[PDB]
């Protein structure tokens, strides 16, 4: 359980979909991010691993206009950019 604390913008996104804390496990962060994508319907209808985030908060956070869930390392990299790993 990698304990992390999301920076301001990411925390805003997590809260927008139900999150109530300031400290999370990476699993929790991924869960909320997934719910954000689903709630906003940012995925491609035909190939649902494709995510469109241009002109969206997620796009500002990740720094890309689109991406595929298949891009595992890139996603973790884009996520960690918006987090700090607790010393604990």
């Amino acid at each position: 359980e990698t304990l992390v604390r999301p920076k301001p913008l990411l925390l805003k996104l997590l809260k927008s979909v139900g999150a109530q804390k300031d400290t999370y496990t990476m699993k929790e962060v991924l869960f909320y991010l997934g719910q954000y994508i689903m709630t906003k319907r940012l995925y491609d209808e035909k190939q649902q691993h494709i995510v469109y985030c241009s002109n969206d908060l997620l796009g500002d956070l990740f720094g890309v206009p689109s991406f595929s869930v298949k891009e595992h390392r890139k996603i973790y990299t884009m996520i960690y950019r918006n987090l700090v790993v607790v010393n604990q």
Binding site: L30, G34, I37, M38, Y43, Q48, V69, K70, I75
Partner: peptide, 8 residues
């Protein structure tokens, strides 16, 4: 989507 996302 969820199915793919779980793979992370």
């Amino acid at each position: 989507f969820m199915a793919f996302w779980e793979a992370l």
